[PDB]
Structures are given as structure tokens and as C-alpha cells.
């Protein structure tokens, strides 16, 4: 099966790429596996495959860390991500995000039901497993539980059957047959949960599939629109209908090649302690436990030699930056264009801890609008910050066409030199805020509201007659021939490879 | 003579360090020398010494580019700067800035007058030179003149004789015997000029010395206090009285080993076209010429085989970032401490185009103040933004003790995650602004006023009971032994030198 359609094949692909380290000696899921993974993520090293995880029994489980993290080289920086999507390993961010957006104007390709698959190779009923006896990692020393769920896909369906959502939300082990996790607005798992709670009749049928098709985990991490079934979007994006097998204890459908599947229910009544967790912005607040949603597990099915993917998230750079930030930015680019805003590109700079998105403006189009910074900032902020795709983003930075938004040095240069603090900004206090950012949920103001800003790094003439400067850089301050002369004589004169 | 006390010796030192490239074939001062230098600065390469500059006649002149720019290696990153100050080439920024501050609580060591020095080896009177016939560089393709003055020191003295100031301000050739340049408030050259203009009797006696003692050019770039003669501060800092020779046509004193000296007057009445110039924030606005101050040159004296230092300034990283930003930050650190503010460190992040300064707070001291963010931001901003040392800085970022302000990744992380836009900030509109920033002089508001902000990246408990988080990073999320185990087994397991 292709790497983008089968996690086991993805792991092979990373090996074949010389992008894997197999660790065949005993590694402890209590912190060690995650510490190695953390180190990998902070240094852009090869992904670790822990084949000998202390506590692994009857096939449950091996761990792959850092599945969507960065490679060291600039030329294949995003190669792990490209390997989720059948793209060349040298694909640019623009190419990855375009691939992720491509299904937005295609007919869905609904999934195909098949009678079995590898995820049925083994099963444990409700007398045979105990989640506290599996080698679930402790990912950070102060976490409030062992976070089994950092890179699987929750599957829930609307009561009416018309929408089946796939998403990543964290969850940890509560006891032998339950998890707790975040189920928070405006996320689709929360929207669906609310529909079941208003119906009031039963708990939400649920599955959590780990080691799913890589193209599916990418869509699981993207804020595609309300009511859109991720399976059909992934099918359109890949050009192929995904093969799904029915759960044994409910009528949900899971990817045939899932490494591990939990089947059960998400309660419409019960909660339990959840967190704290070392999360995407780089922090943990020890002892900061709060009631979260509670999941009951009735069944586990799994592949022979099952592999659990794990995100050891925190400070730069991991899946929470490369996927949450970039995929939100992609959706925001499209949202802006569908609202008639002249945005060509969007990216969440890593330097902002993916709390900003830089929006590249087609300034020819802007000029024809015959507008002003105040008016345009307000329009952009109203579109983005009132929409779910803007949830995680607290600062938007508008930049003109000379800036490559995928290059954080250039975004920081433009922000720092073209946006006058205060005057060139509009604050938004009456929008939903992202409480997980420390300055929100642990800050001085409302945890769930406000704290957002549009920062206009467009210069005045970009609204009127056009850019009126040149950069004081090698590229722009010297004519072409001179530049080429300098480059051609560089090593000659005495001064100091693309792949590496 | 030691490298920190003699520019010719500094050039040797760079060679000896394997930090120089001598270019002995003909190089054009029209753009080529500056393009090579620009490239060097953008890539942290070796400094270029142009020994064969097209238009060099009777000893005037060779060029050294990038004298205060960065080295590639992390271990001696700041070595050029260390070589201005007799510090080891491995000196940290903290050590460099401490050296630059050390004379603040020492008695001045006034200079020593000597009867001659190398700067008298050659002379050209007012019938023998023509500034338009010297190989003065065109540094950026759109500059409004050939900027002879990017790394020399202007020397002017108060009418009463009590204060002699040394400073760097840009100047370009106007005609055979004049320059034009910036002389703007609140700079000391402007303060002194104003005293001569209020007296009304004559033009300001002036000298401009190029290739001065490196320790002197560092102080020339630092906002030491009003009324303090830089020569005596440099003497205290170095422990040695600087040797100075009298000008031939006026009673000012120049460093004995100056490579090139211009003697003349700064007019109290005349102006001429100045600029545009590709400056420190990375921009040039072509055609944006304005009236500047006008200097008359009556005499040139120079060393045999004179060397003109040149800053090819613009986008990162050059002297305008490493010296203007860092030295302002140093003065601001001291200013804050003298105002009883609990600041331990200050640095202008390069990523901010040196428009921000990050202030590290001693949070134990902060807690004893029993204050709030609003009150503390206001106090800090009032101290800094009402003082000349704050002139160039438009954003202050307050951070707690866990942040190394000399590491821009960490400053950006703290700013992005701990400062809630709007709520955690105070805007300052009724302070002097720095017009050279594009969003000021080419922006939407007053060019000379406002646009400043204090951004508080202190978390709430840092004011009360103490830090209440741990980072989700390898350092803080794992115990010591585990960390050390991981490091010790790193290359063993399969994963990937300080000097490189
Ligand atoms: C890649 C990724 C995405 C996480 C995520 C993680 C990763 C690795 C974790 C598990 C390591 C850390 C926390 N995560 C959570 C999360 N969204 C959320 O509501 N709660 C979370 O706990 N997300 C983001 C979420 O997947 C996106 O917001 C999706 O748009 C949600 O899908 P939806 O649009 O269908 O609701
Ligand atoms: C290192 C350095 C410092 C420049 C500088 C440059 C460099 C290389 C240039 C020449 C390449 C570009 C422009 N510069 C100017 C400048 N200050 C100013 O008033 N006008 C300038 O034109 N400065 C900053 C100035 O030297 C500091 O603000 C000093 O504190 C001034 O000394 P003072 O406190 O005695 O007035
Ligand atoms: K999704
Ligand atoms: K602006
Ligand atoms: K000075
Ligand atoms: K704060
Ligand atoms: Mn969804
Ligand atoms: Mn001074």
C-alpha cells in the first residue's frame, strides 16, 4: 500500500529515506521515549522508532515519535510532511498547503467499506485489556496522566448520520477502561458532542484510531469546514476512495490499515480529571488539572506488531507547529479569498509559536480597492477572527508582495519595520480566544475572549500608487550584472551545498 | 600598538584571526566594494580589505568593509567586536556590553596630547584635494550621494570647551570641499550644534576622523550621557589615556593613529541635499532627498597607505545592528538600574531589526515591589522612552529570569506566548520617535512622535508568588539523570562541534 494511505508503509518510507532511527534495545515509556523524541524535535533529527518499549505485551505496542517533524536539511525540510501526501520530499510549504486545500473545490470521494483489514489482526474485549497496563507514555515529567492520544484520530458522527468527523484532540488514560481529554468549542468533536447532548438519549458512539493513513491524519489536523466529512475530503485530495472497516462494537468505520483502534463512547454526562499537559506553546502548568470529557473503551483491535505514533510536543519544532499552524494558515488563506480579500499566501511563523499568521497581499488588487489600513484591517480581522479557522491565531500580520510569508526572518523584518505599534493595528476583544496560549488561560484577562490583533505591515503607498522603496540588501541594492560578477568571483577572491 | 588602540593594528588582528580577505585586484568603489561587503554581512563571512580600490591616488585610500559585523561560528560570533576592546574573541555579548558600561562608574582618564602621529604622515591643503576625485563609495544603487562617512567619528566641542563629543552620524560628499549629513535631535552632534547656533557667532569647529582606535569607535556608537567626553570614557574603559594630536587648522584633537582626518567646520546656517541612504532598518526610498547639515572641509591629513573603514549597512547583519542596537541596549540596562528598576540584562534582538529591546527582570525583586503590570510597564516606558538612550527603540519587551535576552529565539517565544496583545501592553504616543524606521518617517503618523510600546511578557504570578510553569522542552521536562542518559546514548542509539 502507498505511504500516504497506510501508516505501516509510511514508516518504511521514512526508513528508506534515511529519516528513521530504529531503537531495538529497551526504552522506557515513562519519559525516556518522549525525551528522545523531544531531543529529535529540537534538533530536527531522524524520527525514532522504538521497537522494544518496556511494558509492550502481546503486540501492544511499539512507538514512532516525531512523525510530522522537521528534517535538518533545507532542501527536504518538510519531507515528513510530503511523505504524508505522496509529494516529493523536496516539496515546498506552498505545495504542501496547496495539496491540503485542493479537495476544497472537488467533489468528495466517499470511502469504500471493506470486510476486513490489518486493524482486525488482533482484538481484546472488555475482559482482556487494561489501559493502565499498556506502555502508554508519560510525555512530560509534570503531565497529569499518560497521554495515549497525541497522534490518533477521533471518529464521531452527527446523530443524523450525515457528518462523520475525524480530528486530533489530546487524551490521557483515566483508568483501566476510560480516557479523559479535551473536547472544547469550537472544535468539531465538541460541535458533534453538543448535538448528542441536546438529543439527550445516549453517549456518543466513538472510535479512536492510531496509525491511520498519513493523508487522513493531515486532514484530521486541518480545520476544514463544518459538516464536511474528512474521509471524503481525503479521498478527493488523494484521488482514491479510502478503505474503511466497521468497528466490531459500533457502526463507525475506521481505516482498514489502522495500527490500533479503540471503540467505545464519549459521555454526554461524565467528566474526569484531565491535564495538565505540555502543549504546543511550550508550557506546562503543574498541578493545573481541570475536568475534561470522559471516554469509555469497550474494545481494542490492532495490527500484528502495532505501532503507536506519538507527538512529544512543546517548544519548537513538532507536529503542533508544522501541522496545526500551517494547516490553519492554509484554511485561513482560502477563507480570505472566498471573502474577496486579496490574499495570495498564509503561513503561521514558527518564531511566533504558531500564534501569528502572516497574510501576503496582492497589492495590485489592494490598490484597486481604494481603501485604507484601518478599514482593511478591520475587514480581514472580522473575516478570520469570527471563523473557526482563526481560533488558534491571535495576531494576523498583513504584508505586501515582496515578503515570502513562509520565511519567518522576512515576516519578522516586515512586522518590525512596517507596522507602527498601536496606530497600524486593530485589537479585537469580542472574538473567541484560544485559552491554551499562556497569556489567555493563565493571563490577565478573560481566558476565552479577546486578545487578538491585526497588525498591518503594508506601507502607505501600497494602498495607493505602489511600493516606494527598495531593500538595502544584496538582491535589491545592486544591479544584476554586478551581483553575478560578485557571485562568480566569490571563491576566487577568498570567501566561502544546496542538498547538505 | 594594541588592536583596540590603533586601527592599523586592528586590521592585522583580523588577518591574524583568519577573519580578513585581502583583495589585491582592482575593485570599483562605485557599488562593487559595497556589494561584496553586503554579501559578507548577509552571510557572516570574513571582513574584506580592498587594497586596490579604482580611483586610489597618492595614498587615498584602501577600504575595510564589515569592521563590526558577525563571524559565522557561534563560538566567536562577536569576535570582531571583542577585537575592538582587547577582549578574548570568544567573549559573550554580556561581556562586551559590560566592558562598554564599565567606565560609567569610573573616573574619566583624560586624553594625552602628543606632538605628532601617523595621521600626520601626509597632508592636503585646501588647493590640493577634491572630495569628488577620491574613491568614495557608492554604497547602495539608489543612494543620493557617495557616503564617505559610515564608520568615522565626528568630533565637535561645546562653545565653553567643557564637552568634546565623539559620534558616528552618516555623511556624503556634496562637492569638492563639502559634505552633507544628518545632524538630528536628540543626538549629541545636534545638541552641540544648537549651542553654537544660539551663540550665533561662528560655524562649529569640526573634525572627522576615520580609522580611529577601535575602542573609540565603539564609544562613538554608544549613547553615553550628555556632557560626557567620550575620550575620557574610553580612557577609563581601556585603562589608558588616549593619545591625541591637534588638528592643523583648528584646535580640536584627533587620535594620533587616525587613518584619515578631515578638518573644517559644521555650518550653523547652511544646508544641502542629503540622502536618501540605505540605512539600518533595511530600506532606501529612492529620490527621498531632504536638506541636511553641511560641512566644509579645509584640510585632509592621512597615514601612508590609509585605510577607510566602511559599513555597507542594511538588512541583517552589520554594524548598525551589532553596535547601534547592542550599545543602546547596554545604556538602557544601566538607565533602568539607576532608576531603581529590577533589570538585569538588555539586548536589541536582531530579529526586530534592533527596534525592540528585551529587558530581563529580576523577578524576586519585582515581587517585593508589590506592583502590577500596568503600573510597572508605565514606569519602565517613562524611564526609557523619555531618555535619549531610548531614542532608537520602539518596543520594550519585559521578560522574566528564565529568558536569555541575548537569544532572539527565546525572546520571540516569550513575547509570543506571555504578552496578550493590547491588554498586556502600554502605548506611548507623546515621546520622541525615531523617524528613520519606515513606519515612522514613511508611515501613517507623525514622523517624530509616538509609535512606542511596552509589551509585558511577564506572567501574572511573576508579580506575586513566582513562576508557576515549567517549559515543555528537553531541559525542563525531564529529570537530570534521564537527560544525561539520553545525551550519553545519543550517537550509540543512531542520532547526530562547539568551535566549528
Ligand atoms: C497535530 C495536532 C493537532 C492538535 C493537537 C495535537 C496535535 C499533534 C496534540 C494532541 C499533540 C496536542 C493537542 N492537540 C489538540 C488539538 N485540538 C484540540 O481541540 N485539542 C487538542 O488537544 N489539535 C488541533 C486540531 O487537530 C485541529 O484544530 C483540527 O482542526 C481539529 O479538527 P476539526 O476541524 O475537525 O475539529
Ligand atoms: C555604528 C553606527 C552608528 C550610527 C550610524 C551608522 C553606524 C555604522 C551609519 C553611519 C552606517 C548609519 C547611520 N548612523 C547614524 C547614527 N546616528 C545618527 O544620528 N545618524 C546616523 O546617520 N548612528 C548612531 C549613533 O552613532 C549613536 O546613536 C550614538 O549614540 C551617537 O553618539 P552620541 O550619543 O554622542 O550622540
Ligand atoms: K479535521
Ligand atoms: K503599516
Ligand atoms: K557617543
Ligand atoms: K503578560
Ligand atoms: Mn472537521
Ligand atoms: Mn556623546
Author numbering:
A (entry chain A), B (entry chain A): 4 to 499, 502 to 505
Recite the paper's sentences.
The high-resolution crystal structure for E282D (1.06 Å) reveals that residue Asp282 occupies position I, with slight movements in the protein backbone allowing the Asp282 carboxyl group to occupy a position similar to that of Glu282 in the wildtype enzyme. In this case, no C1′ adducts are visible in the electron density. All other residues occupy the same position as in the wildtype, with hydrogen-bonding distances remaining constant. Whereas the more conservative E282D variant was still able to catalyze decarboxylation of cinnamic acid, the corresponding E282Q variant was completely inactive, as shown by both end-point HPLC and UV-visible spectrophotometric activity assays. For E282D, kcatapp was found to be 0.63 ± 0.04 s−1 and Kmapp was 50 ± 10 μm, compared with the wildtype Fdc1 kcatapp of 9.4 ± 0.1 s−1 and Kmapp of 10.0 ± 0.6 μm. Hydrogen/deuterium exchange occurs for wildtype and E282D within the 20-min dead time of the experiment. Furthermore, the pH dependence of the reaction for both Glu → Asp variants is similar to that observed for the WT. This suggests the pKa of key groups involved in catalysis is unperturbed by the Glu → Asp substitution, with the lower kcat values observed for E282D and/or E285D possibly resulting from increased proton transfer distances, as the carboxylate group is slightly shifted in crystal structures of these variants.
